[PDB]
Amino acid sequence: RMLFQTSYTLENNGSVICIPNNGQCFCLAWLKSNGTNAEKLAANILQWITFALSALCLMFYGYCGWEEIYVATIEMIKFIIEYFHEFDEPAVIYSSNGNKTVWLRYAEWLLTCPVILIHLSNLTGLANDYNKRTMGLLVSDIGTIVWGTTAALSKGYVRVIFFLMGLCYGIYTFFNAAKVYIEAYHTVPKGRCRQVVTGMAWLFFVSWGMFPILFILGPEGFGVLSVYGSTVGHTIIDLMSKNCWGLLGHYLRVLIHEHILIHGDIRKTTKLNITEIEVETLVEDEAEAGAVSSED
Amino acid sequence: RMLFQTSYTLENNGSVICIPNNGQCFCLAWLKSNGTNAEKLAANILQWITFALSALCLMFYGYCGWEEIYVATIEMIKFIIEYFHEFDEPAVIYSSNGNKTVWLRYAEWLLTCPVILIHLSNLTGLANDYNKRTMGLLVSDIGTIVWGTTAALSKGYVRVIFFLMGLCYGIYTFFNAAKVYIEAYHTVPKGRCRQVVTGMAWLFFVSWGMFPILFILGPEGFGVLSVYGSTVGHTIIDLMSKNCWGLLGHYLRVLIHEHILIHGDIRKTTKLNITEIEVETLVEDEAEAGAVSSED
Numbered sequence A, B: 001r002m003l004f005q006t007s008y009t010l011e012n013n014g015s016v017i018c019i020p021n022n023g024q025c026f027c028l029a030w031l032k033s034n035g036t037n038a039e040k041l042a043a044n045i046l047q048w049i050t051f052a053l054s055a056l057c058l059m060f061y062g063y064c065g066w067e068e069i070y071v072a073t074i075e076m077i078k079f080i081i082e083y084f085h086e087f088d089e090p091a092v093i094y095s096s097n098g099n100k101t102v103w104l105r106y107a108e109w110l111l112t113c114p115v116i117l118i119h120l121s122n123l124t125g126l127a128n129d130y131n132k133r134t135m136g137l138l139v140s141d142i143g144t145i146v147w148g149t150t151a152a153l154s155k156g157y158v159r160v161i162f163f164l165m166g167l168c169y170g171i172y173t174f175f176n177a178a179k180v181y182i183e184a185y186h187t188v189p190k191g192r193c194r195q196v197v198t199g200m201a202w203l204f205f206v207s208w209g210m211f212p213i214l215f216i217l218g219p220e221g222f223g224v225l226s227v228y229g230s231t232v233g234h235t236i237i238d239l240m241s242k243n244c245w246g247l248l249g250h251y252l253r254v255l256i257h258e259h260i261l262i263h264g265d266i267r268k269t270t271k272l273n274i275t276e277i278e279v280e281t282l283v284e285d286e287a288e289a290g291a292v293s294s295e296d
Ligand SMILES: *[C@@H]1O[C@H](CO)[C@@H](O[C@@H]2O[C@H](CO)[C@@H](O)[C@H](O)[C@H]2NC(C)=O)[C@H](O)[C@H]1NC(C)=O
Pocket: A013
């Protein structure tokens, strides 16, 4: 099917390659198989199921709330492109050093990272304002993806360096994301809302932790995984990272706003020490509205 | 110098290209000259002068304030890479459809866009908090760059579509950036500070407006500009966009903080109508501290 040169002849006992003078790019590296038919079959099924979850989440959100819809919007447009041109440039970049770079993956990441990280900075949906910490999260995360994308396009020691630079930015991101979730947990009402925040923390760190793991394992790293293999891995953590997390988000938001509808905005002053942090604890009792220094 | 195949023989009256079977990538498209020696000379001079401004701004900032230093930090690291490997992959991506994509340019943009846009949302340096508008600026701007990078990697009608998607996100960004500058102007003290804000608005819209212009003019568009030609253009708007703007930023910040040191934080309530906006006008008179509905 390809729109680079696929047809060639070996000459002088395979010391010379002859190609038609048709102006097409040529590299043997590009023509390596993308994997087994079993890997491909598994990947096409998980993609449809991802399309289905993306489709149902959107209609569901149809019944504030912009971050979840957008990630499903970007996710559906992703599947229509995958369906028609998953292995066409520039969904994959076939480059001069022989690399295959899945631009489709990294593009989606850069697009939605501020959406996800704004949503991280707005779990309750009650804030109209964002602290200095939000801004450090966005700067560090975008650096991470830019270094990582550079690492995927590179080879040898240059790939190693950009990966290392991605990891250092990433560590700063994970550290600060942890404090946000801690604050969120002690902010929301004591019941179901704290189960959902806990659910979102698990989904976030496991799914986000799996991306640098799949980088090292894929063609961009030590080439352990095939391309279809990588796609299957990506579909699973994609479902967790995007659809499910925003669905849990929307659910949390509903619970919090309904708390204001029934009990009202009854905040507290839980002074944490996990340092010298502070928090506004929503409670279901009007009585409870004082300073609770819970030094952790 | 190149690390793709540069040496080939024409066979059967130029209907066949023969290349050594050494596993190197090959495309005639990659081997087109990057421009005249005059263009190259001009580009190397402006780069050194950019290195010099980046170097002096950093030492100058050495005598809160993190956004300006970082853009100069990223800018210096950029020049050391340019000096050694400006036309080596992945500073340039040479891809299977024959495109040259200046990844070095787009990477820097993605890295510093949250830094610049946070700084846009913090001209005075007095805010500890960021409004909902900041977040829309970051989402729209990152979309713009991701669509544009996709457009640069693509060809034909797919390049047209991604450019159009970049422009639509871009328009939303420019619209909202305009409101920020309006708010900033009517927030800062009446004297020198409003000259600097006005200076920053001009630099921002002219420099940022010139990027989609240089895209359309370069190899990524209608190929009017050569590669060295594009580099020269980029150096000029780079100096404006990064060094100069952050220097004017730092200067503004100094002026505002010194206002708190002399007069103190004396805010007002200028209710604008350019809609139904509001602003906290810093003044040098303790007397002045009331609601001034200045409907524009
Ligand atoms: C054609 O080139 C091939 C290179 O593979 C040569 O085949 C091999 O020759 C070397 C001997 O120098 C052996 O070590 C290998 O075991 C051979 N086979 C393979 C599969 O590598 C072959 O000798 C060359 N023929 C001519 C006429 O030069």
